[PDB]
């Protein structure tokens, strides 16, 4: 596919492959604390004290694209929607905020967000469900791939949800092959769906093919300890010396911000990797490069507005800011100082994104993000 006359526009395009959905929270586990089964007026008390996996919960890829374009970048989305009212309103919502929809395919065979299953009562009385007809979002075939977004886009971003369906596995791998043939990077976000939180070995087997093709990988703190060892990294966190502390900081019982050494993340490292990001919410971002590694320090505040705080969608803003600063500044790859300086913009965006109800309602602007970054960080850092 070679049709073009003039050079591409200034902000490099971003490729966002996945499923278009509204207010979706993939990463679900068992939270220790519950706040009443009926009264939803008190559920907001679980946003001040998150269950340590929903601290910065990522969402769909459309949320990431919207947050990226709202931060001053340019994004395009590949996906399929049905010929319904909901499908026609999702594309309207994405279009209203300058997200390119040249690669969104409308079809009438399937309905948006609706999938037909079948009850399959097994031995004992435990019911099951088998997908008879797939939902519209996860029904994209490799033939209807826009060979213009892939050529233009410089970063290919996708999440692990597409690894839970058969057809999108092949479609995603074909898109990855095309984008790599055209010279674009591959950004992997590991927002694991519920079924992938079953066992470490099964998930590692599932995501290995996608993991080995990624150039940049972003995972949460729990999504890394789960992938390496949950029991060991939970025993190490809750440990206090029997007699005497060690330095002095250990004598203050502060929170545990452990910077994993390069010999612990080695099983998850390969030659093609250019960056590994581990985000402990908006608190800290550990970055690992081929020749250096470090930690960027940040903060959070949801008690500043206890009645309009909603952590959903902050991880998408963090990832979108990371991508925006990666594409804007191409010298961050081999400069640790510039890397640390440009990684506080993402922290500011993630902090702002937790101050309002709704994932897409309150994604921050670039000017607001810069304002918060400069107001929180000392002039020497910013």
């Amino acid at each position: 596919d070679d049709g073009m006359d003039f050079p591409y526009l200034d902000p490099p395009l971003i490729c966002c492959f996945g499923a278009v959905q509204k207010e979706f929270v993939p990463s679900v586990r068992v939270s220790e604390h519950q706040m009443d089964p009926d009264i939803y007026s008190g559920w907001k008390m679980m946003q001040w004290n998150p269950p340590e996996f929903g601290r910065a919960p990522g969402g769909p890829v459309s949320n990431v694209a919207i947050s990226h374009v709202r931060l001053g970048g340019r994004a395009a989305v590949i996906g399929k929607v049905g010929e319904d009212d909901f499908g026609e309103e999702l594309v309207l919502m994405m279009n209203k905020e300058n997200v390119q929809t040249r690669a969104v395919k409308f079809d009438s065979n399937v309905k948006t967000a609706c999938s037909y299953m079948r009850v399959k009562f097994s031995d004992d009385g435990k019911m099951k469900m088998e997908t008879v007809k797939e939902a519209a979002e996860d029904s994209l075939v490799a033939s209807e791939l826009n060979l213009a977004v892939l050529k233009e886009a410089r970063i290919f971003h996708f999440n692990s949800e597409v690894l839970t369906s058969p057809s999108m596995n092949t479609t995603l791998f074909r898109a990855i092959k095309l984008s790599k043939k055209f010279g674009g990077l591959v950004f992997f976000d590991l927002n694991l769906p519920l079924p992938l939180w079953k066992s470490r070995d099964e998930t590692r087997e599932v995501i290995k093919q996608a993991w080995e093709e990624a150039n940049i990988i972003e995972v949460s703190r729990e999504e890394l300890e789960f992938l390496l060892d949950e029991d060991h990294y939970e025993r190490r966190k809750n440990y206090r010396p029997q007699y005497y502390s060690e330095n002095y900081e250990q004598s203050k019982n502060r929170r545990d911000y452990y910077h994993y050494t390069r010999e612990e993340i080695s099983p998850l490292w390969h030659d093609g990797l250019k960056f590994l990001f581990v985000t402990d919410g908006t608190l800290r971002i550990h970055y690992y490069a081929p020749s250096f590694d470090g930690v960027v320090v940040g903060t959070e505040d949801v008690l500043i507005t206890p009645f309009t705080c909603d952590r959903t969608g902050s991880g998408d803003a963090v990832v979108a800011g990371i991508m925006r600063k990666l594409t804007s500044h191409p010298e961050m790859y081999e400069d640790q100082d510039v890397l640390e300086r440009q990684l506080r913009f993402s922290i500011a965006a993630g902090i702002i994104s937790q101050w309002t109800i709704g994932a897409v309602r309150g994604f921050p602007t670039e000017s607001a993000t810069q304002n918060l970054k400069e107001q929180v960080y000392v002039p020497s850092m910013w």
């Binding site: 007699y243 005497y244 502390s245 019982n253």
Partner: protein, 61 residues
Amino acid sequence: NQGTVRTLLGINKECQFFLILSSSNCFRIGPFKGVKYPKELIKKDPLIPIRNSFGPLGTAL
């Protein structure tokens, strides 16, 4: 949550409190450098690898 007892006592009894010293009260200062050699050692007469140290005179069974 462990701790070491610390009994004030001192052969005095007015209200008799007592303290618990944990790892959060006391810490360790990092490694440094200093001299630690002060000895008056003698000459060994190793027998069955149990030592028979004697300095001035010969072996004295």
